[PDB]
Design a protein around this ligand. Sequence first.
Ligand SMILES: C=C[C@@H]1C[C@]1(NC(=O)[C@@H]1C[C@@H](Oc2nc3cc(OC)ccc3nc2C)CN1C(=O)[C@@H](NC(=O)OC1CCCC1)C(C)(C)C)C(=O)NS(=O)(=O)C1(C)CC1
Ligand SMILES: [Zn+2]
Length: 199
Amino acid sequence: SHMASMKKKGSVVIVGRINLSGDTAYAQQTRGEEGCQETSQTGRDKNQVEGEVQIVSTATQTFLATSINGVLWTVYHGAGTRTIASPKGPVTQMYTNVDKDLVGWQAPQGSRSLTPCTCGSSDLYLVTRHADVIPVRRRGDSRGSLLSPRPISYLKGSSGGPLLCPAGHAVGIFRAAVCTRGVAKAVDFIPVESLETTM
Ligand SMILES: C=C[C@@H]1C[C@]1(NC(=O)[C@@H]1C[C@@H](Oc2nc3cc(OC)ccc3nc2C)CN1C(=O)[C@@H](NC(=O)OC1CCCC1)C(C)(C)C)C(=O)NS(=O)(=O)C1(C)CC1
Ligand SMILES: [Zn+2]
């Protein structure tokens, strides 16, 4: 009831990336925890952004975000309604869909965007926050099975990351793990068509 002391949530902050530009996939950190905390409060991030897949953080969570068609997409359960930090101050979401667990902001200058897949192919690849590439067979509009199941620990923090086709197009955004006895045998993802409709 005391508005003058009500706090504001900070921005989502880009803290690294999954580098996919060469022959080896690897995670890079571009900002530490202390600098992330300060950037989240100000919303002013002057760091150079590169690549398609970003590692992002709030004060309490860390996850991924993926650029497709000029929009940096991630999950609502990670970002909520938060702004993203940017060189000129906080930037408001341009898409928010809690029913799909989806949000998006204009893609940062310097990022590169994935192209939405039109191959109609079901041999996919999930990219995790540790730069593991996980073969996934598509099993429906929004589901795929891991060829080699993994404990959910291995997937935790990778929501917002991409599923790609063999040609490297974006097929979907990783949303939730399909888990029994803590082993992920399948994944739930936001299909790129749903992004394209949301757009
Ligand atoms: C392990 C890595 C996972 C990718 C990951 N995802 C999650 O943990 C998501 C968030 C939440 O699901 C949702 N929450 C929502 C919340 C909303 O408004 C608040 C609105 C819409 C939402 N829609 C969904 C689906 C639960 N869940 C799951 O996966 C759960 N399995 C599940 O529910 O399966 C069913 C059957 C198959 C379909 C759904 C599980 C039990 C924890 C494994 C991950 O990495 N997250 S994350 O980065 O660590 C981190 C928490 C961000 C930091
Ligand atoms: Zn494709």
